[PDB]
Amino acid sequence: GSMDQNTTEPVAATETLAEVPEHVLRGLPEEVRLFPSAVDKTRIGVWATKPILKGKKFGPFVGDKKKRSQVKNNVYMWEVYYPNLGWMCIDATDPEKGNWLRYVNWACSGEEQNLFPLEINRAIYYKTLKPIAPGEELLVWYXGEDNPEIAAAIEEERASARS
Known part of the structure; x- marks a missing residue:
């Protein structure tokens, strides 16, 4: 063995878990936690702190409805047809209007x-x-x-969402 220890966690960022808008971290999956966007935005990012299983369903993503005219290299955004107004774009990328899902980076x-x-x-x-x-x-x-x-x-999520 000898080589089985755990990888040391990152340290020194600038932003703090306590800094993310209390409302965003407030509606987290099981009990996820915010950790600086050591991933990319190098500010605050969201990380697993609790266990996760395959097929988990976490969300739904706030998603504010706005025109594509906005957005620019993001994820928490997509186009969906509304039975109330036609094809629309759903985007939430802010601390105030964007929850924690807005803090999810890329793989x-x-x-x-x-x-x-x-x-x-x-x-x-x-x-x-x-x-x-x-x-x-x-x-x-x-x-x-x-x-x-x-x-x-x-x-697995939708199939299971039935029987």
């Missing part, structure tokens, strides 16, 4: 991605295709039009 190849984009009932859910250990940054991607990370993990 690499389903091996580290912990959350995956899902459109349901004009609502965007974030689901886990793989268990995540407390200390892992929550991340997403898949452009991956109709990739199987999207369908396969969708099936």
